Ligand binder design. Sequence first.
Ligand SMILES: Cc1ccc2n1CC(c1ccc(C(C)(C)O)cc1)=NC2=O
Ligand SMILES: [Zn+2]
Length: 210
Amino acid sequence: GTILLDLAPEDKEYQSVEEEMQSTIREHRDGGNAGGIFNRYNVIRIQKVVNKKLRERFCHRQKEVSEENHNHHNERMLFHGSPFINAIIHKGFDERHAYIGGMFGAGIYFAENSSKSNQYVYGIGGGTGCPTHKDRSCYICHRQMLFCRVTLGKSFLQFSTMKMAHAPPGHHSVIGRPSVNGLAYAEYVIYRGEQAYPEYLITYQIMKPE
Ligand SMILES: Cc1ccc2n1CC(c1ccc(C(C)(C)O)cc1)=NC2=O
Ligand SMILES: [Zn+2]
């Protein structure tokens, strides 16, 4: 099944993942309600997720999308937060567990800003926060998020809600782009689980500003 490989803090691969996570934190329009209030994370550990069957399914679909899209699979490294990340690292991404209430319908959603995915680590809108203290801004409990390879192929660009069950005809993903009277941060949506691989598992705490 799945094996987790510990990355060393002195390794450039660990450093690259932490820097993308830290540098993409943003202030969210909800006043921190969903993910808490913070300007930096304390990274506890970063692990590489290794799984032969999951990697084969992801690579097979990536070759298929590349062939359909002028040899451009358009893979992007994106964050994903979910209360079910344990099932994702062992069984892979699955469109059968889509975010039904998402702005683009029943897809699997990713963000280029780590703090946007942090709003979903404890559920939609942050749920009831950490299991132990029921605090969406808990500074004690260790959180987990994924930094994923996501095959986008030909993306359908949108600025506002457009609910759908599957990708638009001729396309492989939907991108919600930021705009003045619209989204603050981008969101990326796929409708097939084999279009994402949970490359890195990050364990962290949000830090209290001071
Ligand atoms: C809209 C958006 C941008 C970035 C993310 N999202 C949603 C989201 C997510 C994950 C899981 C779920 C359930 C259905 C609870 O599994 C719901 C939502 N995770 C994210 O990383
Ligand atoms: Zn807690």
